[PDB]
Amino acid sequence: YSNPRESWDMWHPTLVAEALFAIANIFSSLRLISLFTANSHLGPLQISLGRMLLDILKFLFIYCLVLLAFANGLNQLYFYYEETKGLTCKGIRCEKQNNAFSTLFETLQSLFWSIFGLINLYVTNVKAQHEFTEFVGATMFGTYNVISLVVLLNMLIAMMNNSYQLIADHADIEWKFARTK
Amino acid sequence: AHNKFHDFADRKDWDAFHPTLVAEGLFAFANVLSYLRLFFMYTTSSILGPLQI
Ligand SMILES: Cn1c(=O)n(CCCO)c(=O)c2c1nc(Oc1cccc(OC(F)(F)F)c1)n2Cc1ccc(Cl)cc1
Numbered sequence: 001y002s003n004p005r006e007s008w009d010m011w012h013p014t015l016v017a018e019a020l021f022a023i024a025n026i027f028s029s030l031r032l033i034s035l036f037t038a039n040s041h042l043g044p045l046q047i048s049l050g051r052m053l054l055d056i057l058k059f060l061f062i063y064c065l066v067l068l069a070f071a072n073g074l075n076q077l078y079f080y081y082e083e084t085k086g087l088t089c090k091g092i093r094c095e096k097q098n099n100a101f102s103t104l105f106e107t108l109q110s111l112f113w114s115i116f117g118l119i120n121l122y123v124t125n126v127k128a129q130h131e132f133t134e135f136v137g138a139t140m141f142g143t144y145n146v147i148s149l150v151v152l153l154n155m156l157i158a159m160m161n162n163s164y165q166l167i168a169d170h171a172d173i174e175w176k177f178a179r180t181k
Numbered sequence: 182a183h184n185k186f187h188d189f190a191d192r193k194d195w196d197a198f199h200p201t202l203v204a205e206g207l208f209a210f211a212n213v214l215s216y217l218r219l220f221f222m223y224t225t226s227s228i229l230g231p232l233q234i
Contacts, residue, residue: 058228058229058232059232061229062220062223062229062232062233065216065217065219065220065223066217068216069213069216069217069219070213072212072216073209073210073212073213073216074209076205076208076209076212077205077206077209080192080205081192128192128193129193129197130193130195130197130202131197132197132198132202132203132206133202133205133206136206136209136210137209140209140210140213159232
C-alpha cells in the first residue's frame with residue numbers, strides 16, 4: 001500500500017503504526033518514575049505510591065463490577081431508542097452528545113466519563129416524548145453518579161488514608177531496599 | 182400487554198405510561214439489581230473479601 005489524508009481507512013497500517021507509536025511513547029516517558037528511587041527526598045514517596053497502587057487496583061475491581069451493572073442496566077433501558085437521523089457525529093465524543101446509552105460499549109464509555117463530569121445531562125432524555133423511561137433512565141444515571149462519586153470515591157480516599165498511614169513507617173526500609181536493587 | 186395491546190405502530194407513537202415501557206423500565210431496574218448481586222460472591226475470595234465487608 002505504498003491521496004488525501006481524509007480518504008484513508010480507519011484500519012490503515014500507517015494509522016495503526018501512528019497510534020502504537022503514541023502509546024509506546026506514553027509508556028516510554030513514564031520510565032523516569034523508575035529513575036526516582038535513587039533520590040533521597042522523594043524516593044520513599046514514589047515507593048509508597050508503588051505500595052498503594054495494588055490497593056488501588058483492589059478497589060478498582062469493585063468499581064468495575066458497579067460500572068458493568070449500571071452500564072448494562074442503562075443499555076437494556078435505552079437501546080430500543082437507537083436513532084441515526086443522518087447526523088454528522090454519533091456517540092458521546094461529538095459537539096452535541098447523542099446515542100450515549102445506545103450500545104454496551106458506548107454505555108460503558110458514557111458512564112466512565114460521567115465520573116469526570118464530561119457527559120452533560122441532556123443524554124438522559126429521548127428525542128421522543130416517553131417521559132417515564134426518561135425519568136427512570138435519569139434516576140439510574142443519578143444513582144450510579146451518587147455511588148461512584150460519593151460512596152466509592154470517598155471510600156477510596158479513606159482506604160488510601162489508612163493504607164498510607166500503615167506504610168509510612170515501613171517506607172524508609174522499602175526505599176532503601178529498592179535503591180539497593 | 183401481549184394479551185391486550187397489539188396495535189402495529191412506531192415506538193414514538195405510544196403513550197408515555199404504556200405497560201410495555203413500564204415493563205422494560207422495571208426489567209432494567211431488575212437487571213441492575215441482578216448484576217449488583219455479584220458483590221456477595223466476593224466474600225469467598227481471599228483478596229476482595231475484607232474490602233467489600
Ligand atoms: C437517586 N436520585 C436520582 O437519581 N435523582 C435523579 C432523578 C432524575 O433526575 C435524584 O434527583 C435524586 C436521587 N436521590 C435524591 O435524593 C437523594 C437521596 C439520597 C442521596 C442523595 O445524594 C447523595 F448521596 F446525598 F449525594 C440524594 N435525589 C434528589 C431528589 C429528587 C426528587 C425528590 Cl422527590 C427527592 C429527592
